[PDB]
Amino acid sequence: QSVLTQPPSVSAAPGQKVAISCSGSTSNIGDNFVSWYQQFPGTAPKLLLYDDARRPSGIPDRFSGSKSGTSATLGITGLQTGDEAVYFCSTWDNSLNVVLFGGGTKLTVL
Amino acid sequence: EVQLVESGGGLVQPGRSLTLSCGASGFTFEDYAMHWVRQAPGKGLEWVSGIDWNSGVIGYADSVKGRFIISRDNAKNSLYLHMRSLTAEDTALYYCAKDVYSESGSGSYYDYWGQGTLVTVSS
Amino acid sequence: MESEFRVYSSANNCTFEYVSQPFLKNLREFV
Numbered sequence: 001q002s003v004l005t006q007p008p009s010v011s012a013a014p015g016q017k018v019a020i021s022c023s024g025s026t027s028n029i030g031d032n033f034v035s036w037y038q039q040f041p042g043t044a045p046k047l048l049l050y051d052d053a054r055r056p057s058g059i060p061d062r063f064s065g066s067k068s069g070t071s072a073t074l075g076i077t078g079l080q081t082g083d084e085a086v087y088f089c090s091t092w093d094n095s096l097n098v099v100l101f102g103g104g105t106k107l108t109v110l
Numbered sequence: 111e112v113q114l115v116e117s118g119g120g121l122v123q124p125g126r127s128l129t130l131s132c133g134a135s136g137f138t139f140e141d142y143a144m145h146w147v148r149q150a151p152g153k154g155l156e157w158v159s160g161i162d163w164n165s166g167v168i169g170y171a172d173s174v175k176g177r178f179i180i181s182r183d184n185a186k187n188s189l190y191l192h193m194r195s196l197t198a199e200d201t202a203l204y205y206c207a208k209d210v211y212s213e214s215g216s217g218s219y220y221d222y223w224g225q226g227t228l229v230t231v232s233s
Numbered sequence: 234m235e236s237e238f239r240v241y242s243s244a245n246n247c248t249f250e251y252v253s254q255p256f257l258k259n260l261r262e263f264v
């Protein structure tokens with residue numbers, strides 16, 4: 001069973017660009033665009049990116065990122081305090097016929 | 111605004127069964143596919159079950175296959191998950207998920223997430 | 234400042250839908 005791979009935790013100073021990488025098998029990420037979810041600790045997950053770069057209403061333009069090949073990249077710019085959250089990349093797998101959820105990356109500011 | 115009410119989650123013994131009920135409001139229930147996602151605290155999100163407009167079962171997580179049953183009623187606007195052979199691994203927080211794509215085959219993302227209920231499986 | 238859908242709270246069991254050109258010192262008579 002393919003598992004989406006994400007770095008455990010990332011820390012950056014406010015105003016520093018943040019890159020998050022999601023690693024998946026060709027059948028999952030290659031067939032359908034990954035969906036990013038921003039979950040604040042102790043809160044229900046909120047969709048951050050739909051169909052890769054496209055952003056759902058209520059998501060800041062500074063949030064960005066491009067998926068190339070089997071890797072999905074989330075780019076965060078103009079980072080601020082209180083933006084700390086756990087990010088999950090989710091892409092359904094045609095071969096596995098099950099939705100796949102990434103381990104998650106713990107973004108934070110000191 | 112879509113609100114996903116969560117209930118039927120409580121401390122339960124391992125060799126027992128438990129039903130989880132999700133309440134759907136602010137959108138047509140039949141029009142949008144509904145999915146179950148659980149996340150144990152300190153662990154990554156894990157997809158558990160999926161269903162569609164025709165109420166056909168999209169599938170179950172391999173770990174929960176044959177122990178979990180998913181069903182929904184379009185008229186009642188509610189979906190119910192039946193859990194059997196509950197284990198410590200099963201213990202997690204089950205959040206209702208609203209899916210924009212009924213087939214959920216491709217480009218399917220969860221527009222809204224339920225607050226969730228805490229299933230605890232212990233002796 | 235549009236207050237929309239404030240005319241009801243629950244909407245279930247839809248049975249008929251229809252969208253067309255809107256009906257509306259000008260008199261607007263209806264029957």
Ligand SMILES: *[C@@H]1O[C@H](CO)[C@@H](O)[C@H](O)[C@H]1NC(C)=O
Binds near residue numbers: 185245
């Ligand atoms: C829905 O409407 C139909 C016909 O108007 C009626 O027979 C049925 O009982 C209704 N069900 C609910 C749940 O409102």
